[PDB]
Every structure is written in C-alpha cells, then in structure tokens.
A paper describes a structure:
The Legionella pneumophila effector MavC is a transglutaminase that carries out atypical ubiquitination of the host ubiquitin (Ub)‐conjugation enzyme UBE2N by catalyzing the formation of an isopeptide bond between Gln40Ub and Lys92UBE2N, which leads to inhibition of signaling in the NF‐κB pathway. In the absence of UBE2N, MavC deamidates Ub at Gln40 or catalyzes self‐ubiquitination. MavC, which assumes a concave shape, consists of a Core domain flanked by a helical Tail domain and an Insertion domain. Crosslinking of UBE2N and Ub catalyzed by MavC leads to the inhibition of the UBE2N‐mediated NF‐κB activation, which is essential in the early infection, whereas the deubiquitinase activity of MvcA restores the activity of UBE2N to allow the recovery of host signaling pathways in the later phases of infection when the bacteria have already successfully evaded host detection.
However, the mechanisms underlying these enzymatic activities of MavC are poorly understood at the molecular level. This study reports the structure of the MavC–UBE2N–Ub ternary complex representing a snapshot of MavC‐catalyzed crosslinking of UBE2N and Ub, which reveals the way by which UBE2N–Ub binds to the Insertion and Tail domains of MavC. The covalently linked UBE2N–Ub sits in the groove formed by the Tail domain and the Insertion domain of MavC with the UBE2N and Ub portion of the molecule hanging on either side of the enzyme. The catalytic site for transglutamination is situated at the bottom of the concavity of MavC, with the Cys74‐His231‐Gln252 catalytic triad (Cys74 was mutated to Ala in our structure) at the center of the concave line. The UBE2N loop containing Lys92 is held in place by hydrogen bonding between Asn318 of MavC and Leu91 of UBE2N. Electrostatic interactions further stabilize the binding of UBE2N–Ub with MavC. These electrostatic interactions involve the loop between β6 strand and α7 helix composed of seven negatively charged residues (Asp196, Glu197, Asp200, Glu202, Glu203, Glu206, and Glu207) and three Tyr residues (Tyr189, Tyr192, and Tyr198) that interacts with a positively charged region formed by four residues (Arg6, Arg7, Lys10, and Arg14) of the α1 helix in UBE2N. Hydrophobic interactions are mediated by Met317 from the Core domain of MavC which inserts into a hydrophobic pocket in UBE2N formed by residues Ile86, Leu88, Ile90, Leu99, Val104, Ile108, and Leu111. In comparison to the apo form, the Insertion domain of MavC underwent a distinct counterclockwise rotation of ≈30° in the ternary complex.
Numbering used by the authors:
A (entry chain A): 7 to 383
B (entry chain C): 1 to 74
C (entry chain B): 2 to 152
Write the structure that this text describes.
C-alpha cells in the first residue's frame, strides 16, 4: 500500500500547503542570503532599526520560486532523490516526433516521470552589410548576418563565423545592390519590402530567402520552458492519465499551478490528447495556433485565452524535448515524508498556514539580524 | 575566466568562462550545469542586473567573482 | 531618409485604419515621433477620460521596441511616476513581427486589465491589491482631475 496516486496526492498537498518549504531550506539561511543581496536597499540615515525594518518587511524571500527550471528541478529531487535525479540529469532529451509517436511509446505502465525542456528558435533577424577590413568577430554583434563584398556569414551566439554556402559572385551582386543607407544595417524578413520595386529590394529579399533556407539546418535553439509530467501506474488504458508540473518566469509558482488545479484540468485532456496538442506546438507554422496551444498548456489557470496575445504572440517556432524514467513510490514518499518531518520539527504549528507564518517570521528575524550586523558601521 | 553563481538557497555553483563571453552565454552555461533554461533566470552582479548583449568584462568581472542567480521575479 | 516603406506604411495604416479608442498621429517634424490619445476604456475606472502619450521609434526601430510615455496623470499600477509602461515580453524579446499597432493595442488593454502583481508604482499597486475598490475610486477621481477636458 504505496500507490502512484499517493505520490501525486502527497506532493500536490505538500506544495499547495508549505510552498517554498518543500525545498527544506532553513528560514535562517533564506534570511541571511536575502539580507546579503538586499544590504544596499537600506537607507543610510535615520534610525537604522526602522530603516532595516522597512527593507525586511518589503521582502518576498519566502515566496516560492518562479523559474520553470528550478521548479522542475526540485520536483525531480523529491520524486527521485538527490543522487536519484543527479543521474537522471545525464539522460539526453528526445525531440518530439512530428505526430507524438516516441513519447506515447516511451510511456510503459510503470510509475514514470517525464521531464520536458522546450526550445525556441533564436535565429537572426538582423543583418548588416560591412567591409571585411572592419569585421572582428569578438567586436561585432552576435546572432546576426554579415554580408561582405565576397562572402555571406552568420556570427552565432558564441561568436563563431558560419559561412552560408554562397559564391562570391552572388555576394558581390547583393552587396552592391544595397545602396540606400538605412538598409545597410536593418532586418531580414521585412514584409513591407517588394522584390518588384527595386534591384536593392530584390537583393534584400533574396539574401533573406538564402538565410532562411540555410538557417533551417543550424542549431539556433535556446531553451525557454521547463516542466515535468507524472504518469502513475494504472490498471487500464482509461484509468491512466498524466499530471504536468510547472512554474513560469514572472507568472506563477508550482503552488499556484496546483491551487487552480491546472494539472487536473490537463489530465482531463487524455494522454494522447495532451501529446497531440503538445506535438502540434513544434509543427504548426501558424503563430495564432502556436500561441493558442502554448496558452492552453503553460498559462496560469484561467489566463489561457490572454497569455499569448498581442505582445506575447509566439513567433519563434518551438521544439519540445522529453526524457523519461521511473519513480519508486517508496523512495519518493520517503523523500516527501522526510520533508514533512523537518517542517513539523522546526516550524511546529497545527494549521499549515501557521507553520508557514512561522517560517516567514523566522526568515525575517534572521534577515533582520544579519542586516543589523552588516550596517553597524 | 572561472566565476561563481550564488543562489538565494546559498547553493554556490562555479563556471569556466571567458572575459568575451556574452551574458546570454553564461545563462546557457548555467543551463548545462543546472537544467534551468536561460529565459527562466536572471543574473545580477553587485546590485546591477545584467543584459543579454553585454560581456563579463563589459560588466568588469573576472576570476573569482560571484553572480547572484535570481529565480523569482515580478 | 524617413523610409523605410515599413515606417511609412505603418504610419499610413494607422491614419487610414486606426484603432478604436486610439488616435495616433506623426509629429510634423520627426516622423519617428507620435502623439497618441487613448480614451479611457468603457467599464473601467478611466471611462470618460482622454490620456495623452508620446511614442518614439528608436533609431534601430524595426527591431528595438518603441518607447512609450504617458503624458497625462493616471492612477494605474503599471505606469510609473514618469508615465513609463512595462513593454516587457514574456520569455522572449521584441521581434520585428510586433508593430506599433500591437503596442498601442497593448496599452489600451492594460487600461482595462490593470495588473498590480507586476507593479511599476508600488504605493498604488499595493493599494490596488488590498483595497481594490478604494483604488478604483481614486482612479475615477484622477481621470476626472486630469483626463477630462484635454483636447
């Protein structure tokens, strides 16, 4: 009698209730470390105890993480354990099949944990014609196209020069077709430029269609999002659904994710239904539906129709990468129960709200004591 | 050349870099070391946030420096 | 210069097919500068006000984001003391597929959907999150105080 739904149940209850506390950092360390980073916010005149008080009160050290990756990291070290997850780090991610195949097939009827990473295509959208005489790869702007008199290169994120397979005769033409001075340093995929207007514009159009072509065989990928999904052992093809666990930068915490029961709402999609949506993210070339689906899956509960609109329209194409492994209910529920010991031992209280309010207070005190120390001269 | 990054948890982690490493690079360094994407991290140094188009020498930090990794923002 | 076509055509499309509740004109001198009046949205504490903004296209415009400043005084937690707004993109930066009209629309939306959990003016955000109804009351007062009788 130690289930897969017993680990979902227990980790969800515990995140919901103790927030940042599931990490099991003492409040005294939060306090000191926050004091350290905030020493400089304290006013320098008046009575220092009050000035310190003012900084300590505005703090939010106890509010849970926000980084989608630090959240998924700490899910990992619960469900799997320190050494557990450290050697799940190793496993390389498998990019998702056009249709969803590899994931479905990578989901036995054990107690498994997929960790996803999601990449955005950070391809260049700036270009600059320039003389070769004045180039300097460690001096110029990275992730950009350079058009020399006789060669067409990409400077990449790390500052490597990557040649774009063009003859020097095509380069010569392009360089010299582009004369009007504010298009010397400008953008590749402008929609207001017309090939059937100038030779310049035909050039700018053409160079752009080169770059677009080359670029679909270059690792421009950078990581954007992180989450986990939890797939408890079922006794059926229907009595089986999945539970995704995320946070998001400047949006929501895992705590928040669970309290609006998004995990549950996405488990009511079905497993094929989830992966089919998730698979479409990486394959559609329509921004409006890339945005829709992104919201559906990754927004905080309730803001699904407004998370990816206007300014947060998703324009980069995305690449979902997954990696799987299994979870021994017995090692996980020991990880969790070992956290609940720590809490009840050091932050005793009979409501949980009370146990947190004690944590915060102990944090605040620690912080106050460090600042009091630091600023006595 | 080689720097430190302290989190609020006090988890210091150390990276090997180059003075002409862009700040967008250190975040990927961190990604490889911690599995946190760069879009879900924020680095500050001596008070000042660091922007993505700049380098460590442009912030004037080399050898045994600590950058604070910040994993909560609003 | 004053080109490219992009700026030219954006400026035409804005004058030709404007955004309901938003008027956005180029300055005679400086075609990269824009006087903007946004009406207080219906069903919001700013209903019946008009708010003046300046929108500047930085000289790298198409890929730098335009800078926006509220001229009119406004009691809103996403506009600082100097009338600056958060234009920040979420796990991304400004693409050139984002045009002036998207930012204008976005400010508009922000007036309808004030977000105190991303504060730019802490006193007012802090009052918006606890005494929302007193926040909104003062918001309506300010729009009467500074955003009525403006043309």
């Amino acid at each position: 009698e130690k289930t897969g739904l017993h680990v979902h149940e227990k980790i969800k209850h515990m995140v919901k209730n103790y927030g940042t506390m599931i990490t099991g950092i003492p409040a005294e360390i939060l306090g000191q470390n926050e004091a350290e980073i905030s020493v400089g916010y304290v006013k320098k005149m008046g009575n220092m105890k009050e000035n310190i008080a003012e900084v300590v009160r505005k703090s939010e050290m106890t509010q849970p993480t926000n980084s989608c990756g630090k959240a998924s990291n700490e899910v990992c070290d619960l469900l799997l354990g320190t050494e557990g997850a450290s050697e799940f780090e190793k496993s390389s991610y498998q990019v998702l099949s056009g249709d969803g195949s590899n994931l479905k097939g990578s989901l036995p009827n054990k107690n498994l944990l997929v960790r996803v990473e999601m990449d955005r295509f950070n391809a260049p959208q700036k270009y600059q014609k320039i003389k070769r005489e004045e180039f300097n790869p460690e001096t110029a702007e990275k992730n950009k196209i350079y058009l020399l008199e006789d060669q067409l290169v990409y400077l990449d994120i790390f500052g490597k020069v990557i040649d774009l397979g063009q003859t020097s005769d095509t380069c010569h033409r392009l360089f010299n077709a582009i004369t009007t001075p504010f298009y010397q340093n400008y953008i590749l995929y402008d929609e207001y430029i017309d090939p059937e207007e100038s030779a310049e514009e035909a050039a700018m159009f053409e160079m752009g269609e080169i770059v677009k072509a080359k670029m679909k065989n270059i690792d421009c990928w950078t990581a954007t999002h992180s989450f986990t999904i939890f797939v408890p052992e079922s006794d059926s093809e229907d009595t089986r659904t999945l539970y995704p666990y995320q946070a998001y930068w400047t949006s929501h915490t895992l705590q928040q994710w669970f309290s609006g029961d998004k995990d549950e709402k996405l488990s009511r999609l079905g497993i094929d239904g989830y992966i089919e949506k998730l698979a479409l993210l990486g394959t559609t070339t329509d921004s409006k539906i890339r945005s829709s689906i992104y919201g559906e899956l990754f927004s905080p509960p309730g803001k699904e129709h407004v998370f990816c609109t206007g300014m947060n329209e998703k324009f980069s194409p995305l690449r979902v990468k997954f990696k799987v492994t299994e979870v021994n209910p017995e090692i996980a529920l020991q990880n969790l129960e070992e956290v609940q010991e720590f809490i009840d031992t050091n932050y005793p209280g009979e409501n949980a709200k009370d146990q947190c309010e004690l944590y915060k207070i102990k944090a605040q005190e620690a912080m106050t004591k460090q600042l009091e120390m630091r600023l006595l001269i | 050349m080689q720097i430190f990054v302290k989190t609020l948890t006090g988890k210091t982690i150390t990276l090997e870099v180059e003075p002409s490493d862009t700040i967008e690079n250190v975040k990927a360094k961190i990604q490889d070391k911690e599995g946190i994407p760069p879009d879900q991290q924020r680095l500050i140094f001596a008070g000042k946030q660091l922007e993505d188009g700049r380098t460590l020498s442009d912030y004037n930090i080399q050898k045994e420096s600590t950058l604070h990794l910040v994993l909560r923002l609003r | 210069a004053g080109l490219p076509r992009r700026i030219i055509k954006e400026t035409q499309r804005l004058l030709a097919e404007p955004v309901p509740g938003i008027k956005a004109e180029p300055d005679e001198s400086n075609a990269r500068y824009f006087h903007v009046v946004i009406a207080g949205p219906q069903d919001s504490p700013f209903e019946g006000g008009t708010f003046k903004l300046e929108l500047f296209l930085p000289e790298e415009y198409p890929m730098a984001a335009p800078k926006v400043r509220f001229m009119t005084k406004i009691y809103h937690p996403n506009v600082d003391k100097l009338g600056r707004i958060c234009l920040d993109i979420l796990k991304d930066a400004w693409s050139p597929a984002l045009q002036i009209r998207t930012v204008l629309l976005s400010i508009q939306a922000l007036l309808s959907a004030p977000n105190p959990d991303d504060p730019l003016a802490n006193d007012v955000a802090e009052q918006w999150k606890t005494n929302e109804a007193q926040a909104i009351e003062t918001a309506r007062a300010w729009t009467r105080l500074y955003a009525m009788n403006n043309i």
